[PDB]
């Protein structure tokens, strides 16, 4: 009855160790432009400055 209450605590601490190692991996994972910039307007493509615009300036 004491070895099982050992193993419960050790299971509950290896759960926290794996929880930390996961949450440290989750930080260095790269993130989408829709999550790490504005959600609305998910493109990085500008089309900026359109009053005297020349066709052929797009690429």
């Amino acid at each position: 009855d004491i070895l099982n209450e050992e193993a419960k605590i050790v299971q509950a601490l290896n759960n926290q160790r794996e929880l930390t190692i996961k949450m440290h991996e989750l930080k260095r994972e790269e993130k989408d432009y829709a999550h790490s910039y504005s959600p609305l307007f998910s493109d990085p493509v500008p089309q900026g400055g359109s009053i005297g615009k020349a066709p052929g300036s797009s690429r």
């Binding site: 066709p55 052929g56 300036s57 797009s58 690429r59």
Partner: protein, 171 residues
Amino acid sequence: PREAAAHWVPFEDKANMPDNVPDVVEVGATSAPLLSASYFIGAKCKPYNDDFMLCREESQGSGAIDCLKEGRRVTRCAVSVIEDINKSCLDEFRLHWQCLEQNNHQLSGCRKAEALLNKCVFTKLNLEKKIPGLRPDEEPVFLKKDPWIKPAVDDFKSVRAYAEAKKNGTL
């Protein structure tokens, strides 16, 4: 796109277009003839000008060399318009752009020669001068009677020709 400043030096190059590009007639019309015949070269050559700018859009940064074949045709068809308007109404076209030579090339100051020219070209060259983007129940501005903005001096030749066209009944 930006203006030359701080001691710009103009230079020209005596050279020729290469062999593979065919020769093209260029427009010799000046700012008042070109601004006069602008609406009629825009009426006849809408799909050619549209083809040129649409090609230039689709081949980005290609630009110059890859839509040359179509910028041939826009210059050719506008030369066709101005040759036809010469041979049709040289006198009234001349009346219009000689009016536009004064008054800062403002189109606001030459209505009475413009009416004569628009009638003569719609009668014979059968092209009409229109303003697009203009939804109905909005009068086009070169049709209105008593505009607020009148020129300083009506030129004399077009007032006389306008009164003579009233008396002839052609107006």
